[PDB]
Design a protein around this ligand. Sequence first.
Ligand SMILES: N[C@@H](CCC(=O)N[C@@H](CS)C(=O)NCC(=O)O)C(=O)O
Lengths: 219, 221
Amino acid sequence: AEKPKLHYFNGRGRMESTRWLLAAAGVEFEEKFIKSAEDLDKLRNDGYLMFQQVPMVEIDGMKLVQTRAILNYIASKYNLYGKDIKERALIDMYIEGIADLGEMIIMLPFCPPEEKDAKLALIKEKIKNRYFPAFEKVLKSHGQDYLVGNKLSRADIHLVELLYYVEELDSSLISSFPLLKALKTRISNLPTVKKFLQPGSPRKPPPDEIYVRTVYNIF
Amino acid sequence: AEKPKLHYFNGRGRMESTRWLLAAAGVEFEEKFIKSAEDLDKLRNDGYLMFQQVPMVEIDGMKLVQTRAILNYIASKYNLYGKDIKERALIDMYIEGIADLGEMIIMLPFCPPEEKDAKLALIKEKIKNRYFPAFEKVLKSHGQDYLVGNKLSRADIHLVELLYYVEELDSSLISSFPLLKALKTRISNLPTVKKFLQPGSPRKPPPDEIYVRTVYNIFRP
Ligand SMILES: N[C@@H](CCC(=O)N[C@@H](CS)C(=O)NCC(=O)O)C(=O)O
C-alpha cells in the first residue's frame, strides 16, 4: 500500500485534526490540495466522496470521508485509542467535548462581523467555565502525564491541538489551568509532535481574510 | 447489574438513537426524565455531567455523556460495531453521514420561523440528492441484506431509524429508493427491532410544541 493521501483545501478547517494525529503517530502522508471549486466537483463527480464532502483520505485501499471515521481509524490503527472498552468510553467522552469546542473555533471566522464580539466571548466563557475546568479535573484526579490509561492517546493529541488554537485566540485563557499548561509542554516535546510544530511541516496556519473567501469560492 | 438509566427530556432529541440501539441489542432500560431546570441542576451539582450537558446514560458503573460516546460503547459491548478495523471504518463513515443529517432534523424544531421553510427544504433536498443515493449505492454495490460485512451492525439501525423520520417528513422521498425500502422492512422485522417499533415501547413521538417549550423552559425559565 501507499502513503495516506489527504484531500482538502490548503488550510486548517476540518482536516487539521487528522494532520495532527497522523504526524503525532509518525506517519508520512501526502496532500492533494483542492485549489478551486472545479477541483472539488471533479472529486464529487468521479465518485470519490461518499457524501459529496471533503475531508477525504485515501488510506489502506479506502476512500474515507467524515472527519470522525477518518480519525477513529487512524487512532485504532496506531494504538492511540486506549486498550479496552472503558478506556475508549473515556477517550470518546473527552474527544467529543474537544470536538464541540473546536467546532465553534472552526466556524468563528465565518459568522458575520457584527456577531463576532459575541460569539468569541461565549467561546471564552465556555473555555473558562466548561471545558478547561473539565479537563484540569481529569488531570488533577489521577495525577498522570496522560488523559487516559497512563499513556499517550488521541485525546492527548486532540487537546493539545486545541490548546494551540486557544493560545492563538487569547494567551491568558490557559493561565488559571496549570495542569493543561504542563500537558501542552510534554506533548509538544514528543519527537513526532515536535517535528510537526517546527517550521516547514504540513501544519496549517490560522484563517486570514484570504482563507475565508477562498473557502467561500469552494464550498 | 441493573438496567442502563437514560437521563434526558421526555422526547426524542439526542437520546432517541441510543434508545433504538439499546432495544436493537435486546437490552431493557429505564428512563429518568428531565422535567425542570432543577432536574438538570441536581445532575450537574452531583458532578455527573462532565460538560454540564445531557444526554447522560448510567451504564456498567460509568456515567457516559456525549451521544457518540454513549453509542460507541453500546455498539462495542453488544457486537454491533462490525468485526475489524476496516468494517468499523465503513460503519463510522456511514453513520457519521447519518448523524450529520440527523443533527439537522434535531435542530429544526428550535429554528426561528423566519428560517424554517428554507431549512426544511434543505433537509429534503439533502435526503433526495445526497444521503438516500449514498446508501442506495452502497446496498446495490454488494447486494447484501446489511450495509456492512453482510451482518447486522449499528449502521443498519441508525439508517432505518432515519428512514422512519424521513417518512414522517414526506413519505414520498424513499419511493425512488427500492433497496432502502427493502432494508427498512427487513430490519423492522428483526425480533428486537419489532418489539421496539410496537405501540407502547420507549420509542418516542416526533417533537411537538409542548416538548419544544418544555426544553426551552429547562435551559431558560
Ligand atoms: N454534542 C453533544 C450535544 C449535547 C447538547 O447540546 N445537549 C443539550 C440539550 S440537547 C444540553 O444539555 N445543553 C446544555 C448546555 O449547553 O448548557 C452530544 O452529542 O451530547
